[PDB]
Design a protein around this motif. Structure first.
Motif, PDB file in Angstrom:
ATOM      1  N   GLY F  10       0.825  -1.224   0.000  1.00  0.00           N
ATOM      2  CA  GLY F  10       0.000   0.000   0.000  1.00  0.00           C
ATOM      3  C   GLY F  10       0.849   1.261   0.000  1.00  0.00           C
ATOM      4  O   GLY F  10       1.673   1.416  -0.923  1.00  0.00           O
ATOM      5  N   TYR F  82      -3.709  -3.776  -4.365  1.00  0.00           N
ATOM      6  CA  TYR F  82      -3.253  -2.452  -3.873  1.00  0.00           C
ATOM      7  C   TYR F  82      -2.834  -1.549  -5.038  1.00  0.00           C
ATOM      8  O   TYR F  82      -2.611  -2.053  -6.142  1.00  0.00           O
ATOM      9  CB  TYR F  82      -2.142  -2.670  -2.849  1.00  0.00           C
ATOM     10  N   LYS F  84       0.420   0.759  -5.665  1.00  0.00           N
ATOM     11  CA  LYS F  84       1.825   0.926  -5.180  1.00  0.00           C
ATOM     12  C   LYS F  84       2.150   2.418  -5.005  1.00  0.00           C
ATOM     13  O   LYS F  84       1.412   3.247  -5.562  1.00  0.00           O
ATOM     14  CB  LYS F  84       2.819   0.294  -6.155  1.00  0.00           C
ATOM     15  N   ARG F  89      -2.621   2.694  -1.384  1.00  0.00           N
ATOM     16  CA  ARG F  89      -3.840   2.234  -0.662  1.00  0.00           C
ATOM     17  C   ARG F  89      -4.000   0.721  -0.843  1.00  0.00           C
ATOM     18  O   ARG F  89      -3.518   0.180  -1.855  1.00  0.00           O
ATOM     19  CB  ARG F  89      -5.078   2.914  -1.250  1.00  0.00           C
ATOM     20  N   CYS F  90      -4.696   0.057   0.067  1.00  0.00           N
ATOM     21  CA  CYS F  90      -5.167  -1.343  -0.123  1.00  0.00           C
ATOM     22  C   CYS F  90      -6.528  -1.330  -0.848  1.00  0.00           C
ATOM     23  O   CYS F  90      -7.379  -0.545  -0.440  1.00  0.00           O
ATOM     24  CB  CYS F  90      -5.201  -2.039   1.222  1.00  0.00           C
ATOM     25  N   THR F  91      -6.713  -2.091  -1.934  1.00  0.00           N
ATOM     26  CA  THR F  91      -7.925  -2.009  -2.800  1.00  0.00           C
ATOM     27  C   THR F  91      -8.827  -3.257  -2.675  1.00  0.00           C
ATOM     28  O   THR F  91     -10.047  -3.102  -2.912  1.00  0.00           O
ATOM     29  CB  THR F  91      -7.554  -1.777  -4.273  1.00  0.00           C
ATOM     30  N   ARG F 133      -2.251   0.590   4.021  1.00  0.00           N
ATOM     31  CA  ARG F 133      -1.400  -0.614   3.843  1.00  0.00           C
ATOM     32  C   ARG F 133      -1.957  -1.765   4.685  1.00  0.00           C
ATOM     33  O   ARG F 133      -2.635  -1.494   5.696  1.00  0.00           O
ATOM     34  CB  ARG F 133       0.048  -0.303   4.235  1.00  0.00           C
TER      35      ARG F 133
END
Ligand SMILES: OC[C@H]1O[C@H](O[C@@H]2[C@H](O)[C@@H](O)O[C@H](CO)[C@H]2O)[C@@H](O)[C@@H](O)[C@@H]1O
Ligand SMILES: OC[C@H]1O[C@H](O[C@@H]2[C@H](O)[C@@H](O)O[C@H](CO)[C@H]2O)[C@@H](O)[C@@H](O)[C@@H]1O
Ligand SMILES: OC[C@H]1O[C@H](O[C@@H]2[C@H](O)[C@@H](O)O[C@H](CO)[C@H]2O)[C@@H](O)[C@@H](O)[C@@H]1O
Ligand SMILES: OC[C@H]1O[C@H](O[C@@H]2[C@H](O)[C@@H](O)O[C@H](CO)[C@H]2O)[C@@H](O)[C@@H](O)[C@@H]1O
Ligand SMILES: OC[C@H]1O[C@H](O[C@@H]2[C@H](O)[C@@H](O)O[C@H](CO)[C@H]2O)[C@@H](O)[C@@H](O)[C@@H]1O
Ligand SMILES: OC[C@H]1O[C@H](O)[C@@H](O)[C@@H](O)[C@@H]1O
Ligand SMILES: OC[C@H]1O[C@H](O)[C@@H](O)[C@@H](O)[C@@H]1O
Lengths: 139, 140, 140, 140, 140, 140, 140
Positions: F10, F82, F84, F89-91, F133
């Motif tokens: 993330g 995510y 990078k 962010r985490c998706t 993350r």
């Protein structure tokens, strides 16, 4: 020594209960129509007994027979029906311990996945149609 | 007996036939059918250690299928299509074997039977122009 | 014998052929066929310990398939397509083996036989311009 | 010999080649092919314990595939596409291994061979601008 | 050695890299690629019992994927896509593990290599703006 | 330690969090996410023998999934989507278990990690409005 | 306890209900749902050795399914769909059994839970016009 699966469909018809003590169903026939999309007539035969036990009016354009070996069980069983006091049976799918299967009629409203085991009997109500149907197995 | 009789399906018409041979099993079966009538018209059976061809019905259709059966090979799956009633006829046969062999003869538009399984030993029913009624016979 | 003879399917036409070598089995077989006529026209066979190529039919077709058979490989699935009757012809062959190998030659629009299975030893039948008739031969 | 020779498929054209090494199996094989002609154009092979590249054909194609083979890995499935006749060509190769690896080179539009299986030890045939003809070679 | 060196595939360009540790194996590998150039650009690798990240190339791509590898987990399937020739590039990687894990990075539009299999121990090749060339390294 | 730490994927934003309980594994995990932003926004976790709910991020998303984990049930497959970079962010999260259970939360449009496997013991990363993350923690 | 409580999912609305019988398990369970609203509306349950029917909710939907459960039959897969929040509702159930039996009721368009597995002992939640909230209860 018996398991009574739920009777599904309506409250109408002439009552039937078919079960020979110390016997099991060796043959079952279902009769249905494309016109009404209902089961109409059922026939059952027991082991070591040539008599046919029947209910309903055999007025449908299709029938299926399933023959059952003496060591064969039902491992999957779906009955399609219309629910409520004015309920009718519309279809049946049976699969056996040997991969044999039959499919009768239609599955457009409600379903029951019943108990499994050695098929011993049937109970319900029938006239012009199968109003209601319950399977019966060995405990 | 030492034999299981599957229900004869179809009508009451035609000449009765029974094909069984003492201590013998079917090594070959042939089905003949027509697109015109959507019916079986003719069946031919051979038994183990016996070169005679046992036939019934009139061989008038435009399609035929033959199934040969190894001595050790059984029927694990069997469907016969028919028209129900006194006036009925046999329209079709699907067989699957213990070795993944399978045949499909004729039509399955009206009624079906999922019969008993095992070592196919004989057939009986009635035939003339058509196969009127057909039932399989297995060893116990 | 020590042989199983599957039914010869197709017509009574052509020159008879028998490809069988004592104590040997089929290591290779080739099927030639046409989209023009939808028939088998030509078959070649090689046996274990024999460099000789046994051939029959006229190699006139626009397709050919070869199946190579390992010494320990058997046939587990076999269908031959043919036109029935005296004027008949063999139109197609589908073979599957004990090792997942399979080949498909020609057309299956008329009659079909699901033959006996086992270690393919030989083939017999009749051929000229076309494969009139084909029977497989297996070890017991 | 201590070898199995799969049938060389394709034409009689091109310079003959035979790739085999004493007590040595194919550790790698490359296939070059074009979308323009839909033929194999070029093959390269490396053997176990030998850094020499054995190549044949004209590497003019817009595609290439390499299969690497572990020392204990065998060929369990093997299809070669080709155009039949004296003016023939090799068009495609599908190989599948004992460890689930697989490559697909070229095209399969006319004729097919399903070859023998086993430890791939060599190749033989003929090439010029194209691979005219290809046969596989396996240990017994 | 105690190592299997899979073929390095792509062009002769960029700065050499060789990432291996004595008595160690790859615990993590990351591939950076771009939709713009349909190329791998950047690779990172971490080893068992070592916190250091060994990177090569320019991380300029819009996608990355990471495969984490358990101590007992091997590679059972491995495909590298590339452009062949002196001016070649490495375009993608698909890897499948002994535990059903897999990753797909980049593009497979030109050439492909199905590599050797086993415990992933290292990588070598050349990189600058792009990954010009990639080979895998396994334990014996 | 007695734990395996999967990579946190993330960005560097948000408030840090670490969810682990001495001699305690994750029994329930919840992911909240939006169609509007295509991100994870919120995560909740419960441990064995512990009725407290550990939560991070803002639950503003229009979807949630819960995975409940039997005491003997492990993660055999695990993918985190995510974006990078430092502003990452985490998706999305995909989990599959030793009993054939599986969840799918959010989006996998940019970057992926296939993580280590085993008995999920905790999570760490950072969150505010979003999950910046996320890394997984397993038993050895 | 001797019981595992899965999360009750949906809203805080409705009349609470708890269906459990001392030393008894569920033998039958019926779900009623509507296409108009895409909600569950009504549930009925029967226990082993007990002829009483336990119902909650308003049976106003146009579909019903009944799953009957053999005495030795367990739940191996279990998804409930729901609208999350204070104002939430149950929208669907999927159940899969140790014997290959399954049912599917309603809709799965917003939030899911994959619950715990095992021998289904009871249910709890709330209901009025609709099923607001559903939790499954298993034996340890
Ligand atoms: O005749 C007694 C039976 O009649 C009513 O049910 C219907 C009839 O049997 C027949 O017309 O067919 C209908 C569809 O099969 C069936 O519902 C009821 O009054 C019933 O209670 C009664 O036993
Ligand atoms: O098997 C059909 C039928 O065949 C025979 O009856 C009739 C005669 O064969 C012929 O004149 O054509 C009629 C039209 O097809 C046919 O019915 C008898 O064997 C009969 O009993 C049998 O049902
Ligand atoms: O294989 C079929 C057929 O081939 C041979 O006859 C050929 C055909 O009748 C036709 O193509 O015309 C050809 C030209 O004279 C003729 O060869 C015969 O071997 C025949 O017996 C065979 O059935
Ligand atoms: O890895 C690709 C490439 O990187 C380096 O040179 C590059 C090429 O000239 C071109 O593709 O564009 C780049 C942008 O400025 C340029 O650096 C070299 O390492 C080269 O050998 C390598 O192939
Ligand atoms: O985890 C995402 C992000 O959240 C917090 O900042 C937020 C964003 O800038 C944006 O969505 O607007 C929010 C409300 O106005 C704002 O809080 C911080 O915790 C940040 O560190 C974090 O990266
Ligand atoms: O390889 C295809 C073809 O290429 C060239 O024109 C020559 O090598 C021929 O002998 C060959 O048939
Ligand atoms: O079930 C929907 C709705 O039904 C009734 O109106 C009440 O019991 C509510 O509290 C509930 O939320």
């Amino acid at each position: 020594n018996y398991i009574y699966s739920t009777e599904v469909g309506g409250v109408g018809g002439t009552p039937f209960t078919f079960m020979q003590e110390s016997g099991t169903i060796t043959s079952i026939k279902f009769n249905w129509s494309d016109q009404y999309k209902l089961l109409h007539h059922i026939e059952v035969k027991f082991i070591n007994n040539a008599n046919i036990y029947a209910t309903g009016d055999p007025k449908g354009n299709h029938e299926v027979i399933l023959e059952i070996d003496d060591d064969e069980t039902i491992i999957g069983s779906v009955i399609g029906y219309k629910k409520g006091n004015d309920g009718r049976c519309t279809g049946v799918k049976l699969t056996t311990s040997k991969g044999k299967s039959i499919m009768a009629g239609y599955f457009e409203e409600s379903l029951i996945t019943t108990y499994t085991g050695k098929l011993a009997g049937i109970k319900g109500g029938a006239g012009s149609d199968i109003d209601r149907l319950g399977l019966i197995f060995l405990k």
